């Protein structure tokens, strides 16, 4: 993220001064497995009967 604005109004030729900083944040998630199974007899895979052949 970032910060909010403000009045800067610097003086001419002034010496510099170091001004803080910003850092990030970590997030993480886990994985998940999904599956399905199927079984079909040999005869049903050869014939052509009605709709499902």
């Amino acid at each position: 993220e970032l910060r909010q604005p403000g009045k800067n109004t610097r003086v001419e030729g002034e010496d510099a001064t170091i001004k803080a900083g910003s850092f990030t944040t970590m997030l993480n998630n886990f994985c998940q497995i999904s599956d399905e199974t199927l079984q079909v007899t040999g005869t049903a895979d050869k014939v052509k009967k009605a709709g499902r052949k």
Partner: protein, 53 residues
């Protein structure tokens, strides 16, 4: 505190990648002196037979 006050250092930054080398060091021995010393042959049955005199 021997660091500049507003200094970005490795302490406060995030997201540093890990340093893991791609080498695995294994030095376990696996030599077989007796196997190498003796002779080799072919058996054609469950029981192997020979004769002495």
């Amino acid at each position: 505190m021997a660091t500049p006050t507003n200094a970005v250092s490795t302490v406060e930054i995030n997201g540093k990648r890990e340093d893991l080398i791609d080498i695995i060091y294994n030095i376990a021995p696996y030599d077989t002196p007796f196997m190498t010393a003796i002779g080799k042959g072919v058996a054609t049955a469950i029981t192997h037979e020979w004769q002495t005199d």
